[PDB]
């Protein structure tokens, strides 16, 4: 019969999708491929290119800043930025900080179309007279591309940083025994999806199944030979 | 000058490469089998890939 598909979510971070009943072994047949395409091909965010006023290179020491630029950048990779516009392929977030405060991701200068999903994310500790001008260039794409690949040049001191695009942090799935069959040995598939919040687990599941389908009708009319 | 390397020169490299073999050497050389012929296969990364059977 027709399987009953239920979606139980939590926030923008977590989601759980239950499908049951299903054929014997099919819970894996479905669950695993979606997990793969999830963890890999889901289109992401997470910046590109960072600049600081006095910084000529990634290892420079910024006065008034306890963290070196490499640890700050290390924390800039952990920054989850969401676009509200599907039309925007790029943007630039500006951040300015002064005095004995602690600079975090929620202290960025706000702009249209962009939002920080983790305002409590620690960027740098600023001491007395510490003044940090910073601008991060956030592009968006799919997968994991190191800084050593993409070129920028956007300004003389601009620094390339590693980019983790895929909004999906981790995906698990559990195949169990469903009470919802005519017979025994039927699978209940449970898809557990953990994302950063740039994209809800439900959306991720949607475009994952979509990509899988697109790759599925790649089987059409081939060219034939008979040895 | 200028490591401009482009798909043209790589495919050309695989044009001169094809069918030809190179000798692989492991020190200390004891047997003659310490040197064996294999093929160029262009692969990303700086490490040479060797067959698991000839290791012995």
């Amino acid at each position: 019969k027709a399987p009953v598909f239920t979606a139980t979510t939590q926030g923008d971070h977590y989601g759980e999708f239950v499908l049951e009943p299903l054929e014997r072994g099919f819970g894996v047949t479905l669950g695993n491929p979606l997990r793969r395409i999830l963890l890999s091909s889901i289109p992401g965010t997470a910046v590109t290119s960072v600049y600081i006023e006095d910084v000529l290179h990634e290892f420079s020491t910024i006065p008034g800043v306890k963290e070196d630029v490499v640890e700050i950048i290390l924390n800039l990779k952990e920054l989850v930025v969401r676009f509200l516009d599907p039309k925007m392929a790029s943007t630039t977030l500006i951040l300015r900080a002064e005095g004995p405060k602690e600079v975090r991701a929620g202290d960025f200068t706000p702009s249209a179309d962009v939002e920080i999903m983790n305002p409590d994310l620690h960027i740098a500790t600023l001491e007395e007279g510490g003044k940090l001008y910073m601008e991060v260039r956030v592009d968006r794409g799919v997968g994991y591309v190191p800084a050593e690949r993409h070129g920028i040049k956007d300004r003389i001191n601009a620094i390339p940083v590693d980019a983790i695009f895929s909004p999906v942090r981790r995906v698990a799935f559990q195949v169990e025994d469903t009470r919802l069959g005519q017979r025994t040995d039927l699978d209940k598939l449970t898809l557990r999806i953990w994302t950063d919040g740039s994209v809800t687990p439900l959306e991720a599941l949607n475009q994952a199944v979509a990509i899988l389908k697109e790759h599925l009708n790649y089987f059409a009319n081939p060219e034939a030979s008979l040895l | 000058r200028q490591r401009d390397i482009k798909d043209e020169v790589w495919d050309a490299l695989e044009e001169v490469i094809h069918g030809k073999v190179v000798l692989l050497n492991r020190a200390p050389t004891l047997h003659r089998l310490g040197i064996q012929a294999f093929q160029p296969v262009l692969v990303e990364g700086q490490s040479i890939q060797l067959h698991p059977l000839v290791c012995e």
């Binding site: 997990r35 793969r36 963890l39 890999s40 000529l56 290179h57 990634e58 290892f59 420079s60 190191p146 050593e148 001191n157 981790r170 995906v171 698990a172 799935f173 559990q174 557990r192 953990w194 | 000058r1 200028q2 490591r3 990364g45 700086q46 490490s47």
Partner: protein, 146 residues
């Protein structure tokens, strides 16, 4: 022009400049041993009409397989305080170059228990032996070494 970019004033590379193998860290010019251009050579010299000039290029260019960003800058010139340079030598110029090295295929890894190893191909997070909570493993070592 384009190869002289980061060389700003005295012919030394600026701070924070990426240097590719073959790129010039510092420029230097040493007068060539005076000799004739060969007949074909001077035919070329005449064709392009470019003046065969005096000095020749001795500049230090970063060795192949090596490259990175410029952090440190040091110039010791003679006739200046705090420094005594050996006879015959005018000035020494030294450049610090730092490199960012991520784990690569072929790099070495080992534990405290004496298990050696080379990195053999890295694997995408997609396919990994993972836990039921979706947590993937970070290595996959071989038991046969034990």
């Amino acid at each position: 022009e384009a190869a002289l970019r980061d060389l700003d004033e005295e012919g030394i590379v600026r701070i924070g400049a990426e240097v590719k193998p073959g790129d010039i860290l510092v420029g230097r010019t040493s007068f060539k041993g005076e000799q004739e251009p060969s007949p074909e050579e001077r035919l070329l010299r005449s064709i392009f009409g470019e003046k065969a000039r005096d000095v020749k290029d001795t500049s230090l260019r970063v060795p192949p397989g090596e490259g990175g960003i410029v952090v440190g800058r040091l110039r010791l010139r003679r006739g200046d305080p705090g420094v005594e340079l050996k006879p015959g030598v005018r000035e020494v110029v030294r450049v610090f170059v730092a490199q960012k090295r991520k784990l690569q295929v072929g790099d070495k890894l080992a534990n405290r228990h004496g298990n050696k190893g080379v990195v053999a191909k890295i694997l995408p997070v997609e396919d990994m032996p993972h836990l039921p909570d979706g947590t993937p493993v970070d290595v996959i070592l071989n038991p046969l070494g034990v």
